[PDB]
Enzyme design. Sequence first.
Site, PDB file in Angstrom:
ATOM      1  N   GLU A  85       0.817  -1.206   0.000  1.00 17.68           N
ATOM      2  CA  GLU A  85       0.000   0.000   0.000  1.00 17.68           C
ATOM      3  C   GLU A  85       0.855   1.261   0.000  1.00 17.68           C
ATOM      4  OE1 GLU A  85      -2.678   0.277   3.288  1.00 17.68           O
ATOM      5  OE2 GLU A  85      -3.399   2.276   2.680  1.00 17.68           O
ATOM      6  N   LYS A 282      -6.977  -0.883  11.840  1.00 16.50           N
ATOM      7  CA  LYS A 282      -6.388  -1.281  10.564  1.00 16.50           C
ATOM      8  C   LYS A 282      -5.154  -0.441  10.261  1.00 16.50           C
ATOM      9  CE  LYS A 282      -6.203  -1.073   5.765  1.00 16.50           C
ATOM     10  NZ  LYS A 282      -5.019  -0.461   5.068  1.00 16.50           N
ATOM     11  N   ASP A 298       4.245 -14.401  11.150  1.00 16.32           N
ATOM     12  CA  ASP A 298       2.915 -14.805  10.702  1.00 16.32           C
ATOM     13  C   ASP A 298       1.937 -13.672  11.005  1.00 16.32           C
ATOM     14  OD1 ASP A 298       0.287 -15.901  10.553  1.00 16.32           O
ATOM     15  OD2 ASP A 298       1.035 -17.908  11.046  1.00 16.32           O
ATOM     16  N   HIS A 395      -9.631  27.047   8.541  1.00 13.04           N
ATOM     17  CA  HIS A 395      -9.111  28.334   8.996  1.00 13.04           C
ATOM     18  C   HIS A 395      -9.586  29.474   8.102  1.00 13.04           C
TER      19      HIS A 395
END
Lengths: 441, 394
Positions: A85, A282, A298, A395
């Site tokens: 990712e 996640k 693992d 802002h």
Amino acid sequence: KHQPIEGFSKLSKQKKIDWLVSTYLEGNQQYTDILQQYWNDNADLQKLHEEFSENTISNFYMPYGIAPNFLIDGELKAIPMAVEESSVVAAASKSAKFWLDKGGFRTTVINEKKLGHTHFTFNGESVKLQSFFNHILKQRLFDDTEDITKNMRSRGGGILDIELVDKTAQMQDYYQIKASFNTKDSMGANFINSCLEQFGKTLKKEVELSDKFTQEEKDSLRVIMNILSNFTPDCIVRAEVSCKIEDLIDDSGIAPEEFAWKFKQAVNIAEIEPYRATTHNKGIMNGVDAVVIATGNDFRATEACAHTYASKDGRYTSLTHCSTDNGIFRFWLDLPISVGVVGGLTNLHPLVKFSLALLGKPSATELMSIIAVSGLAQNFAALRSLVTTGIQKGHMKMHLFNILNQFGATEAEKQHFVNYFKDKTVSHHEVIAELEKLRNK
Amino acid sequence: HHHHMKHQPIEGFSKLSKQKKIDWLVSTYLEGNQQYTDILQQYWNDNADLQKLHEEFSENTISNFYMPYGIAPNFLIDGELKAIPMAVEESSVVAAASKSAKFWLDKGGFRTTVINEKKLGHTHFTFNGESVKLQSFFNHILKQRLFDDTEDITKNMRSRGGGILDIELVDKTAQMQDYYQIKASFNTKDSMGANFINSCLEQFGKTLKKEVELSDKFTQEEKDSLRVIMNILSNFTPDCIVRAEVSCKIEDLIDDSGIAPEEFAWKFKQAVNIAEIEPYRATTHNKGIMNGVDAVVIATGNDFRATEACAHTYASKDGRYTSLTHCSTDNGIFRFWLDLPISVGVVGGLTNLHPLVKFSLALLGKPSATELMSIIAVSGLAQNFAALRSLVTT
């Protein structure tokens, strides 16, 4: 009408691929080339990478990246990360840079207790089984595993304790032999399951030999399974960052107190809203799993353990927490995690060797710390990003509607200013000049 | 740091070339031993353009971490015979998948039911005025405006048959003071949907703030109190979910151990029931499912942190952490099924540029996203079956 293939696993890699491409990919040699372009040129190295799994026909590249400058318990580490990712490794690097001069990351390894069970059934009186266990069988369970555990005990680990658990209120006649283990630098799966398999042998044999049970009661003793548990809430480490709120300085010019409070609010949302905690956790595992893979561990186990832990109090909630008391910002992660740094088949993977050497040949507990730091920094990066985008944008917009409300703008006038400043920036002078043009033609 | 001084931080690491990154890394941490440099370089692809391609998925890429790419053949899935690609480092996972496929090949295979494809996201915000006034404004004015202001964003998705399914206002002030949500559900068709969903939520946040600022229903003080905390999708999608199931007559459960078929079905159900009522077993039990799920998720370029988080959240959704699979042995029929919540894509991901991901999708017959959901759920069910078949016949 594809036909099933017999004896697939005995076939050579090349015949596996020929059949695969003929059957499913119309014999197009371009798919064969795609498989082969990832093969290693070196024969031995390629063969090695075909021995971790089964029916291997190619190598799936996962990017191998570095996030440098993690100050972990006073030492500066570069963390290896295997993750597909985008922005994950960059976010890790940015969190490490943020905390480099604000105390870095500190970890406490709390305990290293791993678990396993002999699940079984038994029809007699529970108290007779408990009494037998307490006075006879428990010692016999240690005795019959002395050979199995000799190597581990010489390494400082072994079976820590053994318990009989009455589960008959959850399932009729269901009991457990529950054991805890220290496996030192091993992940420990083979050691634990070997102990548990001997437990079931000793349980069935000692009960059959005891005079305390009827023959009907003995025949009712049936082992269901002997298997470790991937839920290890007492194999766990805290990673933490902390500084004075005033030292939370971001080049985005945001007030540090405002950032501290908005960050804490983002954590609180994950603590009370499960649909956010899932995404929030996640994000933690983006960091955790990238180092788990890079060190040959693992990640189904670390995932199953961490997300089970996240619901252990009856609600699925956030794994990180945050306080802003007394001018001090604290942000921490209690990560239950079982890993190994020796003894795995994947310790033969050369990039796993590289990862462990890179990190300084860590012990299992030191790698627990490193992985928990990686999860904490990843969570910090996500939340810091999500909260500072909302400060950058709001802002200019809040500046505009306060000027308009101080000038008593109509809703139509307020509408016209939203259009006019869609692409333009919000200056105090420009807003007033345009309002002056609008009202005075 | 045994025999040298304390390491110093590297400035401008990401702007260093790949080789310069490596040289600093090995000099600083590995004593300038070129054997470690060789380990990194031996995994570079011979083709320079392919290597650079694989350096653009993540950041600071200095090598390729080999994950094994394996095949489990002969999966009978909804009447079609598939070979399933699996990227996993753990031994016996692929072999167990093949053995489960083999077992069910002549016993009906695997049946799937894609139940729903509803994905989720939230605008999280605070607001200090009366909840009923915010709700009334949402119900009569704001909700429709949230749809209107996303029309351009959703135009492409709507022409593919997807889009925003519904939008709701959720009062969370009992959990946190002044906390509310815009909760939206989405169909993203063959996309994972992350960028589409997050784009909608960010537009929700802007429309929410703007419409409240323009409304006469609120005081200026109430208007100033409206602050958006974050606009972000949720990886918990309990209604993007597929069942995978196997079933046959109990007398057909014939195993080489010689165990009687009724004894095998009963011992198997027992093993499932223990995961249903013992969380410490359920974790390991569900882990076995994810051995199969994750291997196909990686092989098809999807995000396994998301599938892990979603499935294990699902596993606890009724107040206790429990098994994701279930089993019945009623009336001489063996049934074993998995309800897997799962969100995946088969198009549009930066990883559909990974040639082995393209290979996986072509191998599987160019599945749609719901067909990939089915394939992945079958892989989870088959892995769990293999694990429990071993544990009760050992």
